Structure formats: structure tokens, C-alpha cells
Amino acid sequence: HIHMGSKKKIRLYQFLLDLLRSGDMKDSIWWVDKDKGTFQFSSKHKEALAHRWGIQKGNRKKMTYQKMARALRNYGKTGEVKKVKKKLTYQFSGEVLGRGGLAERRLPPH
């Protein structure tokens, strides 16, 4: 939405870290712990956050909490975003906390 001067690529882990730092109010995702880098997802707003991204992507395809969770969990083996024993809590690695932006790299479908 809204025509842009240049094209950009983002993907799921980038969006949730960017969400807080965007200048929008941190209602859907908030910080647990500034040094640990645990972030807490708000229980009420899980569908709304996923729906906003889904309608940002387009009319045709839905995106929902499960669909996001299956994709989000899959980062854990690489270790960029790590799960906690509380499902709605993840913590983020040094590289993702340190640097934010855009990149293009190939990946298989989920």
C-alpha cells in the first residue's frame, strides 16, 4: 500500500523486531527484558497483528497466528529468534538486535 520510490524486501523476524522501533505504540509486542532481549506477544492482539500483516500482503491469502507461529518457530534451528517455555515469549540474537534493514537471499518454502 502507497506507491514507493524504491522497492524493499522484508521477512517475518525483521517485522516483529521493527514493530516496536517503528514509532507506532508497542501495544501488540512489548519488551520483557532490555538486556536479555526477550519480547512478549500480547495475547488479545495476536490475531490483529497477524491480520494487519495479512491484509498488508493482500486480499487473496489469509495470515493468522498459527500460520505465523509455524514460520516463526522455524527460525529456532538457525537461532536468530529463540523460543522460550512461555509460547508468547521469544528472544532475539545479537545480529538481529544490532542491525536492521533489508537483504535478498534465497530460501525453500515452509
Curated annotation (Swiss-Prot):
Name the organs or tissues of expression: Expressed in spleen, thymus and bone-marrow macrophages.
> Which residues hold DNA?
57, 70, 73, 83
Disruption-associated phenotype: Knockout embryos die at a late gestational stage, with no viable embryo after day 18 of gestation. Mutant embryos produce normal numbers of megakaryocytes and erythroid progenitors, but some show an impairment of erythroblast maturation. They exhibit a multilineage defect in the generation of progenitors for B and T lymphocytes, monocytes and granulocytes.
Query: Localized where?
Result: Nucleus
The Swiss-Prot or TrEMBL record marks DNA binding at 10-93
Protein task: Pioneer transcription factor, which controls hematopoietic cell fate by decompacting stem cell heterochromatin and allowing other transcription factors to enter otherwise inaccessible genomic sites. Once in open chromatin, can directly control gene expression by binding genetic regulatory elements and can also more broadly influence transcription by recruiting transcription factors, such as interferon regulatory factors (IRFs), to otherwise inaccessible genomic regions. Transcriptionally activates genes important for myeloid and lymphoid lineages, such as CSF1R.
Assembly and partners? Answer: Binds DNA as a monomer. Can form homomers. Directly interacts with CEBPD/NF-IL6-beta; this interaction does not affect DNA-binding properties of each partner. Interacts with NONO/p54(nrb). Interacts with RUNX1/AML1. Interacts with GFI1; the interaction represses SPI1 transcriptional activity, hence blocks SPI1-induced macrophage differentiation of myeloid progenitor cells. Interacts with CEBPE. Interacts with IRF4/Pip and IRF8. Interacts with JUN. Interacts with RB1. Interacts with TBP.
Q: What clinical condition does the entry mention?
A: May be involved in murine acute Friend erythroleukemia. It is a target region for SFFV proviral insertion.
The UniProt entry's sequence similarity note says: Belongs to the ETS family.
Task: Specify the protein name.
Answer: Transcription factor PU.1
Species source reads Mus musculus
Where the shown chain sits in the full protein?
167 to 272 of 272
